[PDB]
């Protein structure tokens, strides 16, 4: 499929902990997407596996609600409880159960042992959605945010912090991942996290409004 390249434009910041802080500058260290990075734009009309290199930032600027769910793991053709996520207009049922599913994941609008069966509110409802997945100490963390982009040309400027939704209690050896498609096209961005140091800014309402990447240029090192 077609590959393009796009500046990340200071995007992909998440809340590092579940503690309310207000009117303070806080310096944290986690696995962050670096500022002004080189993310890859994929146009799907057509599919080898994509690496999971210390975490993946995921974004989509699609209004028609076509991109639906992910699979994570190493082999992804049975043999291992890997992941499964389905997000229709009904609930958002996440499974670890493998499926032995084909290499062209199309959905029709016409398995084995099981671990996790979560049911929650619909994730997907000018609807840019950002996701961050990471794997530290056998834990799978998912952060998400919906952003009403006005001009749909590229990844927009500004700041939008990412809030956690689901913390899966187990996951082992995630190195590859894929996506799924819906047919009766798809376009998404993939960026890679990296252990950077950030200086977070909290307003009076506790909302992250600005950040400084301490290893970008010498001016930001001075600011940090």
Ligand X SMILES: *[C@@H]1O[C@H](CO)[C@@H](O)[C@H](O)[C@H]1NC(C)=O
Span interacting with ligand X, options 45-53, 76-84, 140-148, 197-205, rule CB under 6 A: 197-205
Q: How far is the CB of 38 from ligand X (least distance, A)?
A: 4
Does residue 54 touch another protein according to CB under 8 A? no
Provide φ and ψ at 197, rounded to 5°.
-115, 130
The 145-164 site mask, x for binding another protein (CB under 8 A), equals: ------------------xx
Beta bridge partners of 41: 4, 189
Nearer to ligand X, 121 or 205 (CB): 205
Does residue 121 touch another protein according to CB under 8 A? no
Write the CB contacts of 62 (distance below 8 Å, at least 6 apart in sequence): 127, 186, 187, 188
Write the CB contacts of 38 (distance below 8 Å, at least 6 apart in sequence): 5, 7, 8
Question: How wide is the angle at C-alpha 66 spanned by C-alphas 167 and 51, nearest 5°?
Answer: 55
- One residue of 6, 28, 40, 173 binding another protein per CB under 8 A: 173
From the list another protein, ligand X, none, partner contacted by residue 203 (C-beta under 5 to 8 A by kind) = ligand X
**Do 189 and 179 form a contact (C-beta atoms < 8 A)?**
no
From the list another protein, ligand X, none, partner contacted by residue 38 (C-beta under 5 to 8 A by kind) = ligand X
Name the 3-class secondary structure at 218.
helix
**Terminal alpha carbon distance of the chain:** 41
DSSP 221: H
The 201-220 site mask, x for binding another protein (CB under 8 A), equals: ----xx--------------
From the list ligand X, another protein, none, partner contacted by residue 53 (C-beta under 5 to 8 A by kind) = none
- One residue of 51, 122, 138, 195 binding another protein per CB under 8 A: 138
Provide φ and ψ at 223, rounded to 5°.
-65, -35
Q: How many CB atoms lie within 10 A of CB 185?
A: 14
- One residue of 64, 89, 204, 219 binding ligand X per CB under 6 A: 204
Site for another protein, residues 61 to 90, rule: CB under 8 A: 79-80
Nearer to ligand X, 113 or 205 (CB): 205
Distance CA 215, CA 55 (A): 19
**Contacts with another protein, residue ranges (CB under 8 A):** 18-22, 24, 79-80, 137-138, 163-164, 172-173, 205-206
């Amino acid at each position: 499929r077609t590959q393009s390249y796009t500046n990340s434009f200071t995007r992909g910041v998440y809340y590092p902990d579940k503690v309310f802080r207000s009117s303070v500058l806080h310096s944290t260290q986690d696995l962050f997407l670096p500022f002004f990075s080189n993310v890859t734009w994929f146009h799907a009309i057509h599919n080898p596996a994509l690496p999971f290199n210390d975490g993946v930032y995921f974004a989509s600027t699609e209004k028609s609600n076509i991109i639906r769910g992910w699979i994570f793991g190493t082999t992804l053709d049975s043999k291992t409880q890997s992941l499964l996520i389905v997000n229709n207009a009904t609930n958002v049922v996440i499974k670890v159960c493998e499926f032995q599913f084909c290499n062209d994941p199309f959905l029709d609008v016409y398995a084995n042992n099981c671990t996790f069966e979560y049911v929650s509110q619909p994730f997907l409802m000018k609807n840019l959605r950002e996701f961050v997945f990471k794997n530290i100490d056998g834990y799978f963390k998912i952060y998400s945010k919906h952003t009403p982009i006005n001009l749909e040309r590229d990844l927009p400027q500004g700041f939008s912090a990412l809030e956690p939704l689901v913390d899966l209690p187990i996951g082992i050896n995630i190195t590859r991942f894929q996506t799924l498609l819906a047919l009766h096209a798809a376009a998404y961005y993939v960026g890679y996290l990296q252990p950077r140091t950030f200086l977070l800014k909290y307003n009076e309402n506790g909302t992250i409004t600005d950040a400084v990447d301490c290893a970008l240029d010498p001016l930001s090192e001075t600011k940090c």
